[PDB]
Enzyme design. Structure first.
Site, PDB file in Angstrom:
ATOM      1  N   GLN A   1     126.073  12.599  68.760  1.00  0.00           N
ATOM      2  CA  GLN A   1     125.958  11.719  67.591  1.00  0.00           C
ATOM      3  C   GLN A   1     127.049  11.164  67.061  1.00  0.00           C
ATOM      4  OE1 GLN A   1     123.141  10.806  68.695  1.00  0.00           O
ATOM      5  NE2 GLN A   1     121.642  11.082  67.036  1.00  0.00           N
TER       6      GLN A   1
ATOM      7  N   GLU B   1     109.305  18.307  63.696  1.00  0.00           N
ATOM      8  CA  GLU B   1     110.062  17.239  64.544  1.00  0.00           C
ATOM      9  C   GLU B   1     109.160  16.248  65.355  1.00  0.00           C
ATOM     10  OE1 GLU B   1     112.468  19.947  67.051  1.00  0.00           O
ATOM     11  OE2 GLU B   1     113.912  20.356  65.214  1.00  0.00           O
TER      12      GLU B   1
ATOM     13  N   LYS C   1     125.481   8.116  76.002  1.00  0.00           N
ATOM     14  CA  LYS C   1     124.890   8.548  74.692  1.00  0.00           C
ATOM     15  C   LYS C   1     123.492   7.849  74.391  1.00  0.00           C
ATOM     16  CE  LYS C   1     125.804   8.389  69.892  1.00  0.00           C
ATOM     17  NZ  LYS C   1     124.859   7.148  69.515  1.00  0.00           N
TER      18      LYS C   1
HETATM   19  C1  LIG Z   1     113.238   9.156  61.071  1.00  0.00           C
HETATM   20  C2  LIG Z   1     114.369   9.581  61.771  1.00  0.00           C
HETATM   21  C3  LIG Z   1     114.915  10.978  61.876  1.00  0.00           C
HETATM   22  C4  LIG Z   1     115.962  10.922  62.646  1.00  0.00           C
HETATM   23  N1  LIG Z   1     116.337  12.421  62.631  1.00  0.00           N
HETATM   24  C5  LIG Z   1     117.588  12.513  63.536  1.00  0.00           C
HETATM   25  C6  LIG Z   1     118.367  13.740  63.154  1.00  0.00           C
HETATM   26  O1  LIG Z   1     118.011  14.895  62.496  1.00  0.00           O
HETATM   27  N2  LIG Z   1     119.611  14.025  63.681  1.00  0.00           N
HETATM   28  C7  LIG Z   1     119.948  12.936  64.671  1.00  0.00           C
HETATM   29  O2  LIG Z   1     121.208  13.138  65.123  1.00  0.00           O
HETATM   30  N3  LIG Z   1     119.384  11.866  64.486  1.00  0.00           N
HETATM   31  C8  LIG Z   1     118.244  11.558  63.960  1.00  0.00           C
HETATM   32  N4  LIG Z   1     117.799  10.256  64.224  1.00  0.00           N
HETATM   33  C9  LIG Z   1     118.315   9.494  65.222  1.00  0.00           C
HETATM   34  C10 LIG Z   1     119.381   8.734  64.868  1.00  0.00           C
HETATM   35  O3  LIG Z   1     119.634   8.048  63.775  1.00  0.00           O
HETATM   36  C11 LIG Z   1     119.853   7.910  66.275  1.00  0.00           C
HETATM   37  O4  LIG Z   1     119.838   8.734  67.244  1.00  0.00           O
HETATM   38  C12 LIG Z   1     120.973   6.894  65.907  1.00  0.00           C
HETATM   39  O5  LIG Z   1     121.568   6.371  67.273  1.00  0.00           O
HETATM   40  C13 LIG Z   1     122.449   7.668  65.356  1.00  0.00           C
HETATM   41  O6  LIG Z   1     123.398   6.862  64.908  1.00  0.00           O
HETATM   42  P1  LIG Z   1     124.646   6.686  65.926  1.00  0.00           P
HETATM   43  O7  LIG Z   1     124.377   6.100  67.302  1.00  0.00           O
HETATM   44  O8  LIG Z   1     125.625   5.841  64.893  1.00  0.00           O
HETATM   45  O9  LIG Z   1     125.101   8.090  66.102  1.00  0.00           O
HETATM   46  C14 LIG Z   1     116.661  10.017  63.127  1.00  0.00           C
HETATM   47  C15 LIG Z   1     116.365   8.780  63.423  1.00  0.00           C
HETATM   48  C16 LIG Z   1     115.195   8.306  62.621  1.00  0.00           C
HETATM   49  C17 LIG Z   1     114.512   7.052  62.627  1.00  0.00           C
HETATM   50  O1  LIG Z   2     114.548  16.249  63.251  1.00  0.00           O
HETATM   51  C1  LIG Z   2     113.618  15.523  64.149  1.00  0.00           C
HETATM   52  O2  LIG Z   2     112.642  15.329  64.638  1.00  0.00           O
HETATM   53  C2  LIG Z   2     114.669  14.462  65.034  1.00  0.00           C
HETATM   54  C3  LIG Z   2     115.794  14.662  65.227  1.00  0.00           C
HETATM   55  C4  LIG Z   2     116.873  13.944  66.431  1.00  0.00           C
HETATM   56  C5  LIG Z   2     117.956  14.598  66.707  1.00  0.00           C
HETATM   57  C6  LIG Z   2     119.110  13.702  67.354  1.00  0.00           C
HETATM   58  C7  LIG Z   2     118.609  12.625  67.911  1.00  0.00           C
HETATM   59  C8  LIG Z   2     117.103  11.912  67.719  1.00  0.00           C
HETATM   60  C9  LIG Z   2     116.369  12.689  66.783  1.00  0.00           C
END
Ligand SMILES: Cc1cc2nc3c(=O)[nH]c(=O)nc-3n(C[C@H](O)[C@H](O)[C@H](O)COP(=O)(O)O)c2cc1C
Ligand SMILES: O=C(O)/C=C/c1ccccc1
Ligand SMILES: Cc1cc2nc3c(=O)[nH]c(=O)nc-3n(C[C@H](O)[C@H](O)[C@H](O)COP(=O)(O)O)c2cc1C
Ligand SMILES: O=C(O)/C=C/c1ccccc1
Ligand SMILES: [K+]
Ligand SMILES: [K+]
Ligand SMILES: [K+]
Ligand SMILES: [K+]
Ligand SMILES: [Mn+2]
Ligand SMILES: [Mn+2]
Lengths: 497, 497
Positions: free
Chosen positions: B188, B280, B389
């Site tokens: 990420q 999750e 990614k």
């Molecule tokens: C409700 C919700 C919860 C999310 N929780 C996480 C999380 O805990 N960790 C994470 O890395 N991505 C999480 N994501 C997904 C990231 O936002 C997504 O992978 C995004 O592409 C990350 O941004 P980046 O491409 O700039 O790294 C979540 C997205 C949503 C909509």
């Molecule tokens: O906490 C969650 O349910 C989701 C986390 C997550 C982490 C990385 C990429 C997309 C979702």
């Protein structure tokens, strides 16, 4: 007369009383129209159509009932047509339907009773008086290779020694004025019996095909009950009453007394003819894919006054090929696993899988006591089921633990998608009989008749050792009882639906 | 002030006008109750809840909006909340939402405009005046390892060189009065940037977390746009307008002017703390599975008068983790394939798969011109997507031909089940990054961070050579047009629904 599960005419009336019938009294074409209406009913879970004015009906042959075993719209009586086949309440669950279909497996058979006549003898046509090309046989799908008379009737054949009389559904189309062609393929019982007569080599197989049989009997006809077991006695045991049969006029087979339409004749041990293509259970037709099939000669027709032919317009979800083939195979696979000392509680073929998967619910307390592993357990389950006839039509088995309701496709898909790691958590079976009708088999990249099967383990690691180690992230499991009830009790006050 | 896609407060009003909001003005507990109501809304596609009287709200912190990006009940405006994030009509299709999210990928960025103040500066709390344990932070699931403040806000971090400012969603919970802990995992962008600061080794990472940002911005925050691309300028380009930002008081990062709540502080390059477990996206929580996570220090809070915190109650279908994570990943994978000269027209992550699959619609005319095979094509597609990614969260890719609408899960499941032969028609990828959050990965039988991926080819053989060779056995394809229209025109006359 008689009860609906024992008399097809009464079954039709039961669908009417249930407000589950539409009677169409204006002229309807058997060339595509009847089947198009039926197909739409199946795709939308509408009421069953009864075509009382079919273009080409002459001298009582024939009306059509479409979608006899398809789904109703409501959740509460979803499986009500199937329950009307069996004397069950219309709100019966699929567990209760399948348990009813399995109940005869550890009962004494109740052999059938011969009676001297019945409704099926009200009219007859000899070998100078009928022509099968002149009856209103349906063209079901626009690319079909013939007019498929036979989608929901009962073939009757007997072993040369007389000891086993088999009832089963297998498709057949009109070849010419006095013959049909159809599928007769291994490992099906009609094929097994045919092979016995061909090895004997002395004569064609005495045969009958009965349409509009007792609904309990058509359900057993669609079920893979064991080799050598006479379906009439199994249906007897399941319903608690001996079925009444009458002898054919031109052979010594016996047909249900209240059959709507009976063909009598022979299944050839030497002759074949063009058969197919047909719009099949998995949702496809391959135009122009005609192959040689078995050939039936028809010598006589007998029929009820105002005879009704049932018809399955099969294809994409949902019709009899899904509700009966898949569910009944699943039932028999549940029993087969239990008789092999496997801790299976429930089995169902998800409609979402086009009935090519069976989900097996595992008693994980019992599994724990086995002290086994996924690799070993998957291998044991797949060897049992994929080496048996009951497993023929099923290409993927999904093992799930006790929290999953296998009768709920959404939950099976959830567990498959989240608990079974592709590859590592699966075992492929390439040296088992495959089902060629699946497009990826008979029209695929590999052998049409071998392999392509898999056991997918959606049990989590601790389900084999110390017990489930999660809670679902859902309303039911992630909140305490008191809170959930408050929420529910205040739902419409707060403003929700 | 401003339009709904540019101002969260206006977005709330848009949901009200849409009759897509329920305002709950009686006291609601942030310990489980708010999240239980939210969870039920998500499971039933009900209206979004706005909790205006949260037990523990003090000095304007805070109201909660649940289910901000979840589904509506109607088919016609199913994705209407997502469309309200983007200035699209509420009847927008998912193709149209995803095309809007992709539209900035071949436009010049529109950098953001700095303005000297905004609503987010209406109130402030310094480092002697707030305590994060004293705010009404929700406990979302009964087994969660902390109170997850952060489910739907925007983390802001910048590369040490200043050239890339990333906006993304990643969960975080309250650790103590002035710290959070959260996920910061590869690949990420928050992790990528964190690694840059740790290699530099000089200081903790300047950080902000903005809740209730412009809805267009939270959608890009959930999207895997390319490495090095500043989300503010992509959102600018997508919306046609430069976003207005204001500088943080205690650092030099810039936050959206209309943010409801802003935390300012630092992401440690050295310290960790307990994080999780959490309920999750795949539908589970593993009680007691706590691990060390990244640690954030909060130095300042600024907020709007009557601030609203958005919250995702995530878990089983359907919430923001499915509608945004899965769909936006799918969008970016569609573009990635096209930029790799693969003939992909559409991509979507089926909800049925718990957004662990992506179905890729293939232009089979183009595929034919390639003169390739399934083995080769599957390998090429999986190498592109699983080495990127954008493919992180996706474990199965399903290739389907032009007749399949990938946005319709029933059709994806049909094609998967009937056109892809298990094993032979698939390629397993064990040497790619895996997504550990899937239970079969992090709580499974194999490496949590590697492998478990597959490309499943649901293209039929002739789709690579001479063209589709079937017709579906359905109402649409198995009957001529004139007949179908007759049937439809006579449907209710005949007696059907
Ligand atoms: C409700 C919700 C919860 C999310 N929780 C996480 C999380 O805990 N960790 C994470 O890395 N991505 C999480 N994501 C997904 C990231 O936002 C997504 O992978 C995004 O592409 C990350 O941004 P980046 O491409 O700039 O790294 C979540 C997205 C949503 C909509
Ligand atoms: O906490 C969650 O349910 C989701 C986390 C997550 C982490 C990385 C990429 C997309 C979702
Ligand atoms: C509508 C419908 C159509 C069927 N078509 C065929 C078919 O063409 N060929 C076939 O062998 N089985 C067909 N079956 C399935 C068999 O009836 C089922 O496999 C049954 O177990 C066969 O009986 P047996 O076990 O006595 O061989 C059909 C069943 C239904 C409900
Ligand atoms: O014609 C069909 O659609 C189905 C045929 C069949 C053949 C063998 C077993 C089950 C179904
Ligand atoms: K049978
Ligand atoms: K498993
Ligand atoms: K992002
Ligand atoms: K294939
Ligand atoms: Mn049999
Ligand atoms: Mn980014």
């Amino acid at each position: 007369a008689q009860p609906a599960h024992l008399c097809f005419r009464s079954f039709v009336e039961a669908l009417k009383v249930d407000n589950d019938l539409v009677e169409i009294n204006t002229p309807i074409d058997p060339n595509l129209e009847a089947a198009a209406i039926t197909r739409r009913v199946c795709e939308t879970n509408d009421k069953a159509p009864l075509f009382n004015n079919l273009i080409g009906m002459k001298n009582g042959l024939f009306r059509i009932l479409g979608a006899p075993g398809s789904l109703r719209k409501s959740s509460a009586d979803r499986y009500g047509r199937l329950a009307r086949h069996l004397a069950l309440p219309p709100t019966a669950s699929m567990r209760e339907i399948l348990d009813k279909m399995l109940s005869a497996s550890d009962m004494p058979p109740i052999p059938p009773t011969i009676v001297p006549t019945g409704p099926c003898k009200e009219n007859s046509l000899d070998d100078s008086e009928f022509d099968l090309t002149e009856l209103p046989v349906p063209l079901i799908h626009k690319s079909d290779g013939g007019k498929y008379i036979q989608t929901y009737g009962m073939h009757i054949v007997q072993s040369p020694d007389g000891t086993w009389t088999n009832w089963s559904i297998a498709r057949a189309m009109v070849h010419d004025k006095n013959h049909l062609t159809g599928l007769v393929i291994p490992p099906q019982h009609i094929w097994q019996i045919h092979q016995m007569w061909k090895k004997e080599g002395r004569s064609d197989v005495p045969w009958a095909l009965a349409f509009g049989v007792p609904p309990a009997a058509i359900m057993a006809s669609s079920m893979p009950i064991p080799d050598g077991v006479t379906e009439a006695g199994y249906v007897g045991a399941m319903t608690g009453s001996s079925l009444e049969l009458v002898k054919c006029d031109t052979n010594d087979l016996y047909v249900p007394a209240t059959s709507e339409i009976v063909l009598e004749g022979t299944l050839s041990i030497s002759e074949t003819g063009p058969e197919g293509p047909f719009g099949e259970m998995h949702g496809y037709i391959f135009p122009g894919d005609t192959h040689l099939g078995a050939k039936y000669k028809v010598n006589r027709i007998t029929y009820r006054n105002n005879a009704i032919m049932p018809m399955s317009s099969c294809g994409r979800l949902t019709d009899e090929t899904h509700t009966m083939i898949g569910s009944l195979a699943a039932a028999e696979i549940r029993k087969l696993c239990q008789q092999n000392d496997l801790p299976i509680t429930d089995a169902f073929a998800p409609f979402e899988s086009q009935v090519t998967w069976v989900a097996l619910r595992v008693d994980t307390e019992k599994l724990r006591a086995m002290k086994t592993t996924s690799e070993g357990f998957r291998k044991r389950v797949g060897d049992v089921v994929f080496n048996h006839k009951a497993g023929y039509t099923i290409h993927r088995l999904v093992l799930v633990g006790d929290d999953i309701d296998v009768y709920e496709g959404k939950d099976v898909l959830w567990a498959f998608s989240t608990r079974c790691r592709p590859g590592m958590d699966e075992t492929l079976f390439e040296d088992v009989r495959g089902f060629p009708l699946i497009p990826y088999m008979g029209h695929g990249n590999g052998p049409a008749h071998r392999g392509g099967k898999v056991v997918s383990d959606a049990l989590m690691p601790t389900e084999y050792t110390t017990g489930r180690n999660w809670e679902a992230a859902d309303f039911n499991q992630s909140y305490p009882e008191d809170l959930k009830q408050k929420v529910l009790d205040n739902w419409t006050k707060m403003g929700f639906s």
